Every structure is written in C-alpha cells, then in structure tokens.
Amino acid sequence: LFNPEEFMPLDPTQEPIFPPELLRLKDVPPKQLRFEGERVTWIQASTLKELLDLKAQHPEAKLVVGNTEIGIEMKFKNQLFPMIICPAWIPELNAVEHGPEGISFGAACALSSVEKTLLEAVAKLPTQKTEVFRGVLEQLRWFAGKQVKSVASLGGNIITASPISDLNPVFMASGTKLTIVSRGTRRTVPMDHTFFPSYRKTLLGPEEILLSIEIPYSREDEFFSAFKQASRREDDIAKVTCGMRVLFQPGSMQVKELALCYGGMADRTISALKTTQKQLSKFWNEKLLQDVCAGLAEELSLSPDAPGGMIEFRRTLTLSFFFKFYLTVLKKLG
Amino acid sequence: DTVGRPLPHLAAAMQASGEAVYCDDIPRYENELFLRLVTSTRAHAKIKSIDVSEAQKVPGFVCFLSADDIPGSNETGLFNDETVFAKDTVTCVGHIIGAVVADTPEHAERAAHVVKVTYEDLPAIITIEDAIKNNSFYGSELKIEKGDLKKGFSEADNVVSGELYIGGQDHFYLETHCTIAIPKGEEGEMELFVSTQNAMKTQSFVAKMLGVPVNRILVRVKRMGGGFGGKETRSTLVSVAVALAAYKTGHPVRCMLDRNEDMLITGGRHPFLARYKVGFMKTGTIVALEVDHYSNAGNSRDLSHSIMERALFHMDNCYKIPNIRGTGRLCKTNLSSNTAFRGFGGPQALFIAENWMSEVAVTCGLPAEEVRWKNMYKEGDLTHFNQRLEGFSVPRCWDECLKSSQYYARKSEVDKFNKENCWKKRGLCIIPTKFGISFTVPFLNQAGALIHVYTDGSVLVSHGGTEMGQGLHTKMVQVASKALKIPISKIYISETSTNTVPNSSPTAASVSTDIYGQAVYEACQTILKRLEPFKKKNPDGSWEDWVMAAYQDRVSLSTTGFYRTPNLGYSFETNSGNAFHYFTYGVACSEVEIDCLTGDHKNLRTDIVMDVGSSLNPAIDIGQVEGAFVQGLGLFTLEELHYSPEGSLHTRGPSTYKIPAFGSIPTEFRVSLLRDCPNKKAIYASKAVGEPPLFLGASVFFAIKDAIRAARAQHTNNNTKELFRLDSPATPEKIRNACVDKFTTLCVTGAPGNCK
Amino acid sequence: TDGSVLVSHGGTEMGQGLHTKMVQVASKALKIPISKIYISETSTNTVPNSSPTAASVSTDIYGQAVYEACQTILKRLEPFKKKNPDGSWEDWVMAAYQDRVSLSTTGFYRTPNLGYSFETNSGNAFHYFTYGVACSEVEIDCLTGDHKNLR
Amino acid sequence: DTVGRPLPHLAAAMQASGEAVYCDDIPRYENELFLRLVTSTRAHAKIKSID
Amino acid sequence: TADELVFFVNGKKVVEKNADPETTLLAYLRRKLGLRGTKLGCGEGGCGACTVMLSKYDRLQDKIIHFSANACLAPICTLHHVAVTTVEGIGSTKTRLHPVQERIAKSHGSQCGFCTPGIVMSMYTLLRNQPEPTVEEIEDAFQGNLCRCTGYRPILQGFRTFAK
Amino acid sequence: TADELVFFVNGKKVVEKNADPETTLLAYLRRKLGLRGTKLGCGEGGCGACTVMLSKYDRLQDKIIHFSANACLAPICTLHHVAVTTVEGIGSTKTRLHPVQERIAKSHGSQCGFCTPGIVMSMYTLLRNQPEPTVEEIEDAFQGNLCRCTGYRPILQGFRTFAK
Numbered sequence A: 001l002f003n004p005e006e007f008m009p010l011d012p013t014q015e016p017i018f019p020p021e022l023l024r025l026k027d028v029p030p031k032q033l034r035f036e037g038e039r040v041t042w043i044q045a046s047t048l049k050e051l052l053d054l055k056a057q058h059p060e061a062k063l064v065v066g067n068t069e070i071g072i073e074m075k076f077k078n079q080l081f082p083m084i085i086c087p088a089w090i091p092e093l094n095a096v097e098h099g100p101e102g103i104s105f106g107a108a109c110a111l112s113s114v115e116k117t118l119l120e121a122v123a124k125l126p127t128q129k130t131e132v133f134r135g136v137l138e139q140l141r142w143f144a145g146k147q148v149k150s151v152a153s154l155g156g157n158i159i160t161a162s163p164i165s166d167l168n169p170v171f172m173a174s175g176t177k178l179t180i181v182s183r184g185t186r187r188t189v190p191m192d193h194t195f196f197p198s199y200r201k202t203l204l205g206p207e208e209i210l211l212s213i214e215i216p217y218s219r220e221d222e223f224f225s226a227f228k229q230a231s232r233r234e235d236d237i238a239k240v241t242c243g244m245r246v247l248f249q250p251g252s253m254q255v256k257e258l259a260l261c262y263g264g265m266a267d268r269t270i271s272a273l274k275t276t277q278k279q280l281s282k283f284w285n286e287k288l289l290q291d292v293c294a295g296l297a298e299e300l301s302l303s304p305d306a307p308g309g310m311i312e313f314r315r316t317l318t319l320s321f322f323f324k325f326y327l328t329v330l331k332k333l334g
Numbered sequence B: 001d002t003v004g005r006p007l008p009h010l011a012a013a014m015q016a017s018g019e020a021v022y023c024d025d026i027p028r029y030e031n032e033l034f035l036r037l038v039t040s041t042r043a044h045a046k047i048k049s050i051d052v053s054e055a056q057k058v059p060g061f062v063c064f065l066s067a068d069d070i071p072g073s074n075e076t077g078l079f080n081d082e083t084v085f086a087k088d089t090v091t092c093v094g095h096i097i098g099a100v101v102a103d104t105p106e107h108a109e110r111a112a113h114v115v116k117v118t119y120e121d122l123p124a125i126i127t128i129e130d131a132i133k134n135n136s137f138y139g140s141e142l143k144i145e146k147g148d149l150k151k152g153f154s155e156a157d158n159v160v161s162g163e164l165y166i167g168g169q170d171h172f173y174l175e176t177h178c179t180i181a182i183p184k185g186e187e188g189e190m191e192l193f194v195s196t197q198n199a200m201k202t203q204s205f206v207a208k209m210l211g212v213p214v215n216r217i218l219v220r221v222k223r224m225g226g227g228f229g230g231k232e233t234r235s236t237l238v239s240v241a242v243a244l245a246a247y248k249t250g251h252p253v254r255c256m257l258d259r260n261e262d263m264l265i266t267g268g269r270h271p272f273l274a275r276y277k278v279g280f281m282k283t284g285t286i287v288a289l290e291v292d293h294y295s296n297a298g299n300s301r302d303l304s305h306s307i308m309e310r311a312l313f314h315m316d317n318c319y320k321i322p323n324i325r326g327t328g329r330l331c332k333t334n335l336s337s338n339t340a341f342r343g344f345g346g347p348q349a350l351f352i353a354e355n356w357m358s359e360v361a362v363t364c365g366l367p368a369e370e371v372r373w374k375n376m377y378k379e380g381d382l383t384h385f386n387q388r389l390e391g392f393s394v395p396r397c398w399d400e401c402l403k404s405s406q407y408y409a410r411k412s413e414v415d416k417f418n419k420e421n422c423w424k425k426r427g428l429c430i431i432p433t434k435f436g437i438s439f440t441v442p443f444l445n446q447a448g449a450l451i452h453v454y455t456d457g458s459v460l461v462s463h464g465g466t467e468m469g470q471g472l473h474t475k476m477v478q479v480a481s482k483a484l485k486i487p488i489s490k491i492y493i494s495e496t497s498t499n500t501v502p503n504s505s506p507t508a509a510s511v512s513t514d515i516y517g518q519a520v521y522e523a524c525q526t527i528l529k530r531l532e533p534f535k536k537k538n539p540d541g542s543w544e545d546w547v548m549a550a551y552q553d554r555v556s557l558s559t560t561g562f563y564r565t566p567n568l569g570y571s572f573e574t575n576s577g578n579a580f581h582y583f584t585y586g587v588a589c590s591e592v593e594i595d596c597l598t599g600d601h602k603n604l605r606t607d608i609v610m611d612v613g614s615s616l617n618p619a620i621d622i623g624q625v626e627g628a629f630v631q632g633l634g635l636f637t638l639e640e641l642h643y644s645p646e647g648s649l650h651t652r653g654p655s656t657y658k659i660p661a662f663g664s665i666p667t668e669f670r671v672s673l674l675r676d677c678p679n680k681k682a683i684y685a686s687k688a689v690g691e692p693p694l695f696l697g698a699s700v701f702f703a704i705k706d707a708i709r710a711a712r713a714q715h716t717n718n719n720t721k722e723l724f725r726l727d728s729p730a731t732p733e734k735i736r737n738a739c740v741d742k743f744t745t746l747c748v749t750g751a752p753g754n755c756k
Numbered sequence C: 001t002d003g004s005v006l007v008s009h010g011g012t013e014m015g016q017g018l019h020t021k022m023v024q025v026a027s028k029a030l031k032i033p034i035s036k037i038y039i040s041e042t043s044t045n046t047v048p049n050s051s052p053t054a055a056s057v058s059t060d061i062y063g064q065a066v067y068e069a070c071q072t073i074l075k076r077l078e079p080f081k082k083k084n085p086d087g088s089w090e091d092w093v094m095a096a097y098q099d100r101v102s103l104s105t106t107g108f109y110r111t112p113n114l115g116y117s118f119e120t121n122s123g124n125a126f127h128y129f130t131y132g133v134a135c136s137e138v139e140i141d142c143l144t145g146d147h148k149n150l151r
Numbered sequence D: 001d002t003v004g005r006p007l008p009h010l011a012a013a014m015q016a017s018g019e020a021v022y023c024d025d026i027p028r029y030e031n032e033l034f035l036r037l038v039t040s041t042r043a044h045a046k047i048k049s050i051d
Numbered sequence E, F: 001t002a003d004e005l006v007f008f009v010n011g012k013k014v015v016e017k018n019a020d021p022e023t024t025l026l027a028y029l030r031r032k033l034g035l036r037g038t039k040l041g042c043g044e045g046g047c048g049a050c051t052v053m054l055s056k057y058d059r060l061q062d063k064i065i066h067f068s069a070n071a072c073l074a075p076i077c078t079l080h081h082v083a084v085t086t087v088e089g090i091g092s093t094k095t096r097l098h099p100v101q102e103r104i105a106k107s108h109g110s111q112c113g114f115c116t117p118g119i120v121m122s123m124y125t126l127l128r129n130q131p132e133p134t135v136e137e138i139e140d141a142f143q144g145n146l147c148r149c150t151g152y153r154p155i156l157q158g159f160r161t162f163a164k
C-alpha cells in the first residue's frame, strides 16, 4: 500500500530551535504576575510565601495548576471563580523528595512526573518496598493521554475529590501522607476515610493548600493491589476503582491491618472499615474470603435507584476485585 | 492510468500539515458574528417563558432569535414535521428553542447559558417499550413476507423465540456540525460554507425558512472532518439557524457546535428492539423466521422510514429462508430525532439475524460455521424480497477467510485455552455479510457532474458528491484521468457547490463512487468526442495542442454528465422489482479473550476478506474496510449512550462515551480484498465499500458471546444448549453480569444461589 | 426543485443591462415569468474560456447560448407537461426531478461564417452592421470658444 | 414574455438604494490587507535602485 | 494594572498586553493568531485534536523540557515564558513536510484529516524526547488522540518506521 | 489627551473616542461603520459619487439646515454634533424605497449604478430644502455629480416629476 524505503530520513539535529530569546529570559527572576479579564483576576504566585499571603487575603481564591478540572467546571458546569491563583511556579509545590518513609511529590507535580519517578523507583528497589508505588502505576495505566498527564497535577486530582478518582482510593488505602499549609499553619495527615467528608469536599480549611504528598514504601509482610472498572458512563460517579492493602503479623498469614477503599460506590471515596475491622487477627484463607465478600456486599450495598445504576455489576466488581487481591496476596505469601 | 493503484488521498499531505481548510478554519469577516443554540432541558413540556434579560447583559451580546423572527416558514425537516425553533412545546431534551448571536463564540456561549426557560411538563415517552405501550408510532407497519410461515413452523424440529435490543450510536465525527452564512444584502442572496453531506437540502431548507427562491442560496462544501451519515440531514439544524442570524443582522454569522451540543442535539443511530421466532431442523437448516423490529426514531421522522426499509431488506443477512416475515415499526419518542449512521438500519437487522443464527447453532449442538455455511444462499438464489443474487461472492470470501485466518487450528487453540483457564476465556467467531447497493428511494439514484477544460489543458471537475474523508474526490480524479487518458496532475476538484451541480442527492448509501464516477465518466466521453477531430488532425500532438485547437475552432470545452441507476424500483405491494443494483460482500473472523472477573476483554486477532470488485484504489478501500470495521466494533462492544429516566443524555463527550481508541483495535488486524471479482454493474468494475464492512465488527461481539458461553460452562451450570440474552453493546457490564458465578450470585458470601 | 432558475453565462454586467436582457430571453424561451429566473454573477467555474464582454456582441452571443440551454430544459420537461397538462411549471419540474431527469444544462453559440482574410480581401469580417443617423445643432461664442449644444 | 418591453435594469432599485454590491463594497476579512502600486515617474529609464 | 503575558508560538514572540484569565490556548491560536491547524474536537481533554507541544526551560530541573498538552484546556495565563509548537511549526507542503507528516500521509493514516494534526503533534513530541523510541513507546503515545475514520492500523504502521 | 467626537449617522449615535484628524467621512462610513452605499469616485470633490446630506442646528438662522457635502473631503473632525444621512438612511429595497430612489430606478436613470447613490443624495437634499422645486432648481442640483453611463437625459426626466 506504501513504500517506506522512499521516506525522508529523520534528522533530529535539524528540529526547530528552542527560542533563543526565551532562553535569555530564564535569567530574569520570577515575580508575581497579575492578569485582569472580563470576569476573572489571575495571580501567578512566584513564592510559597506569596501564595499563603494571597490565600489569607482572599480565602475564596481558586487554585489552578493544570486547569484540567477547573476548565471543565468553568465551561460545562458554568462555575465562575472571580479570583484565581496559579501556584505552578513555586519550587516547594514541584519538589520530588526521597525520604526514609517514602517518596514525596509537590502538589503541582504533573502525573507524568509522578509516573516517571515511580517507574524508576520500581525498577531499582526491591519488590517488597514498591507495593504501593506499583498500585499507583497500575491506576495510571489507561488513565489519560500523554497530553493530560503532562499538565494534570497530583494535588489537583486529590483535591478535585471526584467520587471516581482512581488515585484517592490508593492514597487512602496506603495512608499516603498529606502536608497541608496556610499562613501560620502546617500539618501532615495520613489520608483516611475522614479526608472526604462529602461530595467534592476535602478536610481542608478555606485558606489551606495541599503542599506535598508522600507515597509510602511498603514494609515487610505488606502487600498492595489496585483495580479499576474498564467502563465509565457518568461524568463523576459509578465507576468502581479501588486500592487494597494488607499488613500481616511478622512472617505470618495473620492479618494485622487491612484497608479496602473504593471509588464509584458513593458520592466520595470510601473505606469498607466495618468489613476490614472484623478481619483483624484472622488468617488469610477461604473463610476470610467468604467473610470479606459478605461484608462488602452489605457495607457497600447500593439501592436499586442509586445514582449511576449498573447496580449488580458494581457489587460484583467490589467482590471480584477483592478476589483478585486475595489470590495475589496468596501468590506473594508463597 | 492510476485506477487500481494505491494513490494516497489527494489532501492527505495538507491534512498532516494543518493546511487543509475545514469550515471553521475559514477566516472570519471583520463584522462576522457567532451563534449559539438555546435548547430544551425537558423531554416534553410547554414553553411558558424565555427570559433573555441576563443574556442581554453579557458583553458583545447582539440578539436572541426565536420562531417569531423567521420571515418565511418555521416548518422544516425532511418530512416537514419539525420546527426551526420550537414555539409553544418542546418534545425532546436538546430541542432547539432559539439562538443567541454575539461578537465572539465565548460571548455567545456565556449568553446562551443564562437564557432562562420556564416549562410546564407533559407526559413523556422515552423508551421503545414506552412507545409500544402507548401506541406511539410514525406511520403504519412495514412488512416483507415470503412463503408460508404456519407451514414452515409446522415442519420445524425446533423453535426458538426471544427478544433482543441494540443500543444506538453517536457519530463522533471529529469535526462537529458547522455553518458560515454570508448574507449579500441583495435580492435575498446568501452564500453558505457548510460541513454537510447534503448541500441540496441545506439550500432548500435555508430558502424555505427565509421565504426566498432556491436560486438565491448558494451552498458550498469543500470537505467535512467526518460525516458518517450524521451530516446527511441533521446539519440543517445548525445551517438554518445561522442563516436566520445572517438574514436578521445583515452580518456574516457562524456556528460550530461543541461536542456536548452535537451529541445532544443532532441525533444518532437508531436503537432497535426485536422480537423474533425461528424454526429450524436438527441439522440447523432454517425453515421459518418471524421478526418484529421496532426502532427508536425520536421526535421527528427524518430518515427513520427508509432506515427501517433497509433493516427489513437485510434481515436475511446471507441466509436462504423459505418462510419469512419481517415487520417494522418506527417509535415516536421524546428524544432527539435519530438519523442516518453508516449502515442505515442494516447493521441492526444483520445483528438480529446473527443473534438467532447463533442460537440455532447452540440449540442444535453444532459448530456455528457449519450451520452458517449450510444456510448460506447460493449463486442465483432470490432474497426474501425476490431479488436475484448475481455474482454472490460470500462462499469465496468465506473459504479464503477460513484459510488465511487459520480458523480451524485457532479453534482448537481457543478450546485448549478454555480448558486451561478458569477466570479468563477465549472466543472465536466467523460471520459473513451482504449489503445492498443503492438508495432505497429510487429517485435519489441520480448523479451529476460538470467538467471544464481550460485553455492550458488543466481540467476542473465538479460533481454532486462531497468529501468527508472517504477519498471520493481522489477516486473521481483517478476516474477522470483514466477516462481522458491524461495524468492526474492535470485534473483538480476544488469543492462541491449548488451552483455547479444542482439537485444533488446527499453523499450517502455508499453509492457516490458508482454514481458520480459514471457522471464524471460521461462528461469525459463528451469532451473526448469533441476533441476527437483535433486528435485526428494532429495525432502526435499533445493534450494541450488538441485543447487549444478546439478552443480556437470555437468548440465548447465544458460539459455536464449525468447518471441514473437503471432497473430500480421495489414494490412492497408485489414484493418484486430491484431494491438494489448489486450487493457488496465480505467475511470477518475475530478472536477475543475476556476477563471473566471484570468483563474487560482483549481483541486478539481479526481477519477480513472483502469483495469490493476491482478496486479503484486498494489503499482507500482497505482504509474504508478498516474504519468501518472499527466503527462496528465500537457499536457492538464499546459505545453506550445513557439517558436519565427523565430522558436527558448523560453521555455527552469522550470521557463518558468511549469510541475505539488506538489500543482498542485487534492486535493482529488483517484485511484482504477479494481477487479476480470484477463487478460489471459499476464504474471500472469496482464496488461500493463505505458501509458494507461495518457490520463485520459484530464478529467481535459474537466472539465475546462464544467466550461468555465458555465462562458459563465453567461456573454457571451444565446446560450446553442454554440460550442467554446478550444485548448490544456488549460492554464490560453486560459481559461481567453474564459470567454468572459465585460472585454475581453472592454464593461466595455463603448464600445459596444460581451457580454450580 | 422549487422551479426557480439560475442562469449563468460568460458575459459580465457593467451597466449595459446584459443580465436584464438574458433574463428577458430566458423568460421568453422557457415561457415562465421573469420573477422565477435569477442571474447572480459571472464566474470561471460555471462558464469557462469566455471571451471578454466586448465588441457589443454579448446580447447576440450569450442570448443564443441561453436560448439553446432553455430549449434543452423544455425538451426534458415536455413528457411531464403531457402527463400533467393542467399542472404548473413547479409541478412539472418536481416530476422531472423525481423521474431522475437532469435539470442542468449548458448552452453554446458559435457565430457562423466569419473569417476575413487580409491576404485575399474576402471572407465576412462581421455578422451584420448596426446603423444610425444623428443631427446636431450648436451655438458658439466666437469671443470665448464656449458653446451650447442646442438640439 | 417581456421581450420588446421597457423593463428597468434588474439591479436599478438596489443601485438607487446603495444595496448593490461592487467589488470594494464586499466586506473585508479580519486579516485582509491592502495593496498600493509603486509606479515609474519617468517615461524611459534604467532602474538604478529601490529604497 | 495588568502585567504583560509573554510566550512563543512556532519560534515567534507573542506579547499579550491584556490577557484574559479565561482564554484557552486553542482559542488564542485559532482566533487571535490565525493558526487554524490545531483543532477543536471536544473541549474536555479526551480527543487530542487540539494537541500541541509545549517547551520551557525548567528552572528546577536546570534543562529545556518538551511535552504535549491539550490546547483546549491550557489557559494562556499558565504559559508565561513557555514556547508553543503547533502543526504549522514543524513543516508544510509549501516548504517541506516533517517526516512525521510525510509518513502519516503516505501510509494512508489520514482520511478526513481532522485528527491528523493532533496525532502528528503527539508523535512529534515523542521524537523530540526520544529520537530512538521503541515500538512499544510509539504504540503507547496516542492514548489521548481519537480517530473516527481510519481504524488506527495505518497510523501505527507508518509510525513504527521510527522505532527500534 | 483627546476629546470624544460625537456625531450621528442615519439617526444613530457615533461616539468616536480616538478620532484621527486625517480621517475622511467617506473612509469612516465605508470602513468603520460598514455603510458602503456611499462611493469613492475621485477623492478630489469633482464627481459627487460620495455625496451625503449633512444636517445641523444653525445659530444665526435659528433653524435646522440641510446641505449636501462630498464625504471624500469632509474631515470627520468637522462633524461634531452634525447629523449625516447616507443613501441607506432614506430607504431600502428591504423596507421601502424613497420616492427619489424609486423614480431614478423606474425612469432608467441608473445603468452601472455607481453614481446613483450620490445623485439620489443630491436630489434628496434639494427636496429637504424645497419640497416643490422648479424644473430649473432640479437641473442645477447636480453640477457636482458625474455619470458616465446614462447621458443624463433619463435622470432629469425622472426627477422632473417632483417639479411644478
């Protein structure tokens, strides 16, 4: 149909040059910028201090990094935010830090950057340390185009708090640590069920901004899986997605900790805490599989008229995903 | 002579460079305004007020248009049963009520959003079942019947009856609907640049709304970024509104729809419900078939009738059935009016056919390919509508596909896989198709061309067809070049326009190559006849010499050409007369692997053998087969439109409506064009290819169904001959729910339940 | 298909009323009111290889081309006239359309028997001649050179 | 049949109203530019330079 | 008093003295700069018809970086000191086609053509980061680009020639 | 710093906030306001193709006065608080023609039509000053309007109907 032998060869040294004038401007120190529109004032914050001052002066000011969510809210939900602050330039919001407990990403780090860093960590570190990382990576597979992942921030996905976020269930199940700041405040909390109190809301004060996110190393006797539904039918509900973690007593099959967190089963990310609490000190066997499935079927039960429908399918996925986790943990145990 | 050569699409390089101009890429006039439609948020309601007070405060706001502003007629649509702008009552979510005009598209958007409508709800009918229960239909029952059904069912060893549903489909042309209208300010003259397959109806509908003669309206179509039938009629929703804005303001006006608007307003493929009963022998031979078809037509007729006719013409697929009755009813519902979509009712009827055929094989406990083969038409058989199948190439396609796909060896590997795997299963299916070639309405089978040869010998060809990616202009240039015996470099097609070729049929029914090819050919013959005396006097001279000599002897170098497809005219009263000119044929074998725990699946391998006659351009035709197949893949396995109980579309963009992606296609994807099968009935022995291959995407669906059957054998029960209902699309939800096991039943929780 | 007619020809309008005359010709030839006929513009993609609008011959030559095209239309419509004799133009046009008869045609005219030769002083240089006579009266001012055109 | 009748020029009313469009009356595209010819001020000469 | 917004498009400096925070890159390219090669297909990040390449000197990484972005969602106000490359920045039929453009066209990877600029820019971006990509990297570079016409096979076949 | 220039065109208020002293009324009408009925024929006052009517309150005469002017030579900066009437201000085929427009058309006074708006405005201005002019006043009304097509006879004959 065509003849590749006749194609012009690629000469990668002959590509359009990066604008030399733009390169000369890299020396110019960053300063706060203000843009004024018909309806919106936009402040480009150059420093963390500037961000915290602005947020103290205008708590209602909306943060925008990648705009991959805000652009949707403004265009399709007719939301208007008269003041926007873009913190993308701020070094602290972009830092990738390797620590004793895990890998920290500034909240403005693009998902592409998260993916690259985590892929490197998985390639170099022992399997037993990278269980949570691998879960994040699985959720980032078949997630969005390279275009989206290059500008979509990690923090943006978290704080968007969509019921069907593929990342929040993994962060919740793993107790991923969130460092949160405002003028005169700084606190770090592991993500848990309390972090999402209601639809599209998080447990942040009106002034508070998410600074950094520490994704933990997995420990000995600790295993993780993440799964997600392969269809999406509503804008922000009814797509099952999950993170699952078990910690055993040293060298055993006896449950010490268990966390099963799901999106797409309610109007926020939730944890099947009643179900998992019942399994503490139990052994990883057929009885546990039965009891967990019984618990999930009850705890995450959906009304026939639940928003999003696909009621049977969603229930079946909650159990089927746990089944996959159950078998995977058995393979990892031995 | 490039006919039969894989010439790339003439505009491909400009498309790759971003130089090809689509409607909205045309520069704006200094004074050009923008229109945004204002549509209903209710399925069925009286309009009690429209409040534009907030819209008027938006910077750049110009005006709000409604029915009262129309100078001519507010009655529109193919069957004159629509409004341009709804006046008293809305009859679907997305029903156009009016439009905002503003100085920028951003401003038009802003203004339209704050237009407030007050409604009084009326009882709505959304579902096909809703419509049947309420006797809500357009027109009367359509029917084709042959033989003696009572006798056939008496002779049958086995009878299977059931119900089946196939969901609709959004066109998702990458370029949405758009029109620019330029009012000239003299005599009602208006010139429109439109993304449409139907310049003629665009022209006539604009003229009717304005109340001016059709000769005042000029419609121009350079190209569409996809059409797929969705621009055969429904483009006029945008065109007529933009024309009104141009008329009213005296400014140029344009509108391009955002995706969410387009999916809501413009209609899609018709959902179908079928109730069917098939009688057959223990051998799998069919002796009786009764199928009642119901389409969900939405809130106007549009092309719904002819779509159902095509459905009825295809309920046989490739199978001889001596006793047969097919009926069809068009459901009148409070949804956006459904329209043409590649296949035009064919894929739905063909899917229904393959579903009961799949059930015959299962019931008989026989290999599906054997039952299909046994029931296949032979050369010279009559269809259920009494048309003779001449040049019936399905057996050749079937045999070649079986061989090249290594079907039998792979069948054994699929079985081996299923023996060795508990929670994943493979499936493999081979399916034939035939697709009738011609508009079901005889008068649409006409085509015009206009050719000019300029004094430098360069040739400008105009024809009634439009380019929407299918390579029609490319093929026409190849045809003209062969016909005139000059290089393709000497020929050009610029656009499609109502002032060069009038009264054109829409570019549809897969027939454009056939009918415009003939018209172009005839125009070329006329030119050759006129040049012949000059060639005779100067036989070693050039084309350019002959052209100049003709010019200087005052011989006209401009001619029309015209073609009228012969011997067409089916009668539902006599069940006789040709419905089609000929049929296009093909066969596809697909293999899948399903995840029985999640409902996800992989498309492992697809092999296609398509009879496109002697191809004018194998590259373009293979492209048509692949693209059509993948759209069919989408229809049957990925694409799902979803509505609220109140009838409001939820799935309004790519985040919630999943068309096939790069990673969706079969890992091994093989297409072959059948060799040595010239078609005497069309231009240079070629065949129509546009729509015929789409149904072959169902091979993926029936492979999935095969896999589900293996899963049910593994975990559900012990009944080998069990029939279970699998509607289309076979989404992860439907696949997963069908793999009945300890999870679906909750038996894993300790409860008793309906698995083994 | 509404019966409205769009005429294109090789001539241009510069104030001389050529389009007016062509509409009058088409109306007479087709036997329909001038209101049903329209000329929008002159364009190279409708009529190619046109001579310039010049030599005073435009009415003569485009008139013939328009006439011929109209005769072709009439021939094609005739069967439908005979099927619906008390019908309207609009009815006949739609019937023709629905019977897949083309409602588009070219017309062409080549002025016969022209070809003067300077090397034989023979052959018609012109098709015919236009003739006229004028009588004018003036009054001059012999002292200024100004004058009145009296009649 | 109006042949031989004094029918006014078809465009006369629009010419009288200023609605008849002549070339320069056509609206300008947003990006449309304007040309002015540069011409000789000499009857016959060599062009030595253009500045 | 507003600051000037300064960015580059296809090597050319753009100085926007009155940037509106609501303005998308796609709107700016098409309706201010008159560069219509970049298309609107959805406005919601799923179709990639609006794909462009962005380049900047990353002051935190100490290097020039290149990546793709959806122009329909990128606020121009995020682009201070960023360089945009569109389809018209890499080649044209009036000058010379870029290899990416030549190969998609010659391989029958363009039918209606509406998705072609976005796909070109996705492939272009890949090559700018990795001039020697694997088949796997190429086959995985287009999750954000939809094509309704081609069934994708020819696009991948044409682009696989860049691999190994 | 600059003052606002305020005038009227066909009864509509024009507020020019940045008037250039060099800008002619003809250029402003055609290229700012998009009123193209008024034509350019010479730019030097001899042809009248650009004729408009101007109206203003006279302090001395204590009345509203109406007179014709060549738009090609009228600086817009002379027009503060003046009302302009162009050919489109008096009638249209979309609404109703003014008697002046109807009569010149039906009398065969328009051939190519390019001079017609200017002649219409000259006659219109006369009638606004004198509703029943003499035959003598009518001919004298057009020393500033040139027509290349008609030979003038039909224009005068058409307008004579306004006399007596």
Ligand SMILES: Cc1cc2nc3c(=O)[nH]c(=O)nc-3n(C[C@H](O)[C@H](O)[C@H](O)COP(=O)(O)OP(=O)(O)OC[C@H]3O[C@@H](n4cnc5c(N)ncnc54)[C@H](O)[C@@H]3O)c2cc1C
Pocket (backbone or CB within 6 Å): A062, A063, A064, A065, A066, A067, A068, A069, A070, A071, A107, A108, A142, A143, A144, A148, A151, A152, A153, A154, A155, A156, A157, A158, A159, A160, A164, A165, A166, A167, A208, A209, A210, A211, B655, E044, E045, E046
């Ligand atoms: C086409 C496409 C496909 C997608 N698919 C998926 C998917 O499959 N699964 C999934 O989980 N997600 C998906 N996403 C969502 C995507 O991950 C988020 O939109 C993105 O991460 C948001 O980041 P952003 O920088 O663009 O946020 P923005 O739109 O700029 O802001 C988002 C929200 O976060 C707030 N915010 C941002 N930064 C901070 C901060 N540091 N502190 C406090 N608040 C902050 C903003 O105020 C706003 O409320 C998809 C998005 C697109 C467009």
Ligand SMILES: Nc1nc2c(c(=O)[nH]1)N[C@H]1C(S)=C(S)[C@@H](COP(=O)(O)O)O[C@H]1N2
Pocket (backbone or CB within 6 Å): B226, B227, B228, B229, B341, B342, B343, B468, B469, B470, B472, B507, B508, B509, B510, B511, B512, B513, B624, B627, B689, B690, B691, E111, E112, E149
């Ligand atoms: N690229 C492309 N191929 C396409 C379409 C399209 O919009 N784009 N439309 C299809 C439909 S619905 C029809 S009817 C035929 C119409 O063109 P043809 O008659 O020239 O085949 O093209 C088919 N193939």
Ligand SMILES: Nc1nc2[nH]cnc2c(=O)[nH]1
Pocket (backbone or CB within 6 Å): B229, B232, B303, B306, B310, B340, B344, B438, B439, B440, B441, B444, B508, B509
């Ligand atoms: N696309 C299409 N349109 C039609 N209109 C009438 N018949 C047909 C048909 O068969 N196909």
Ligand code: MOS
Pocket (backbone or CB within 6 Å): B197, B228, B229, B230, B232, B340, B341, B342, B343, B344, B507, B508, B509, B510, B691
């Ligand atoms: O016949 Mo194609 O336009 S559905």
Ligand code: MOS
Pocket (backbone or CB within 6 Å): C053, C054, C055, C056
């Ligand atoms: O022959 Mo007239 O154009 S001088």
Ligand code: FES
Pocket (backbone or CB within 6 Å): E039, E040, E041, E042, E043, E044, E045, E046, E047, E048, E049, E050, E051, E070, E071, E072, E073
């Ligand atoms: S236009 Fe579809 S992703 Fe931007």
Ligand code: FES
Pocket (backbone or CB within 6 Å): B174, B225, B226, B469, E109, E110, E111, E112, E113, E114, E115, E116, E146, E147, E148, E149, E150
């Ligand atoms: S070529 Fe048409 S959408 Fe890709």
Ligand code: FES
Pocket (backbone or CB within 6 Å): F039, F040, F041, F042, F043, F044, F045, F046, F047, F048, F049, F050, F051, F070, F071, F072, F073
């Ligand atoms: S243009 Fe000739 S007088 Fe003004």
Ligand code: FES
Pocket (backbone or CB within 6 Å): C015, F109, F110, F111, F112, F113, F114, F115, F116, F146, F147, F148, F149, F150
């Ligand atoms: S009508 Fe032509 S200049 Fe007067």
